Amino acid sequence: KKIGLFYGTQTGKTKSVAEIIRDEFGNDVVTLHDVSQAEVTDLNDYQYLIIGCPTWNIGKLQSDWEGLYSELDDVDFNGKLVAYFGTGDQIGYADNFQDAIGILEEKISQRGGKTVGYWSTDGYDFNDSKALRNGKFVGLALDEDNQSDLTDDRIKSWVAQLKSEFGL
Numbered sequence: 254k255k256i257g258l259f260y261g262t263q264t265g266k267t268k269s270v271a272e273i274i275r276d277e278f279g280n281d282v283v284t285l286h287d288v289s290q291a292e293v294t295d296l297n298d299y300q301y302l303i304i305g306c307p308t309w310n311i312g313k314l315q316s317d318w319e320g321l322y323s324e325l326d327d328v329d330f331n332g333k334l335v336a337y338f339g340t341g342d343q344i345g346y347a348d349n350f351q352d353a354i355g356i357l358e359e360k361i362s363q364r365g366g367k368t369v370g371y372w373s374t375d376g377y378d379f380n381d382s383k384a385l386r387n388g389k390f391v392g393l394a395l396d397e398d399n400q401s402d403l404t405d406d407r408i409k410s411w412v413a414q415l416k417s418e419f420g421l
């Protein structure tokens with residue numbers, strides 16, 4: 254209802270984290286949107302938005318989000334509060350860890366979106382990320398490949414941080 258969660262997924266991993274974020278907020282609060290089936294004007298249907306995106310070869314947006322990225326100039330995000338999460342592999346892609354949510358955040362915040370849900374880099378091992386803003390991550394960084402065991406507590410903490418920042 255109130256929050257729209259817009260995710261893109263190639264191997265199902267960002268999709269399953271989205272479901273866990275959805276159940277943590279309440280199914281009554283967040284509705285899931287796979288960007289493969291989305292129009293970019295679907296983002297207009299919400300004042301509170303959650304962006305979910307993994308980084309793929311080579312340091313690119315997942316392909317469904319990549320498709321929409323070009324059209325982001327056609328939507329106005331002013332007044333909207335926007336959160337970001339991604340899944341990533343910090344061991345194999347230490348130079349591009351979570352680039353996708355940083356790429357998306359740059360554009361959306363430029364087109365009006367107000368970023369909520371900044372996350373600590375304490376607990377990760379990487380060299381570089383387009384997702385860094387004053388030494389914080391732009392949203393929750395998940396690692397299902399190397400750090401899957403940490404993911405449930407990260408979601409629980411971040412959703413609680415978000416419920417508070419969104420005003421639920």
Ligand SMILES: Cc1cc2nc3c(=O)[nH]c(=O)nc-3n(C[C@H](O)[C@H](O)[C@H](O)COP(=O)(O)O)c2cc1C
Binds near residue numbers: 261263264267311351
């Ligand atoms: C060929 C390939 C390229 C990848 N490139 C990156 C990348 O540059 N940055 C990153 O953080 N993770 C990278 N990864 C890891 C994926 O982002 C990670 O496994 C993610 O969870 C996949 O999410 P999805 O299942 O929702 O598509 C790559 C994985 C594959 C197999």
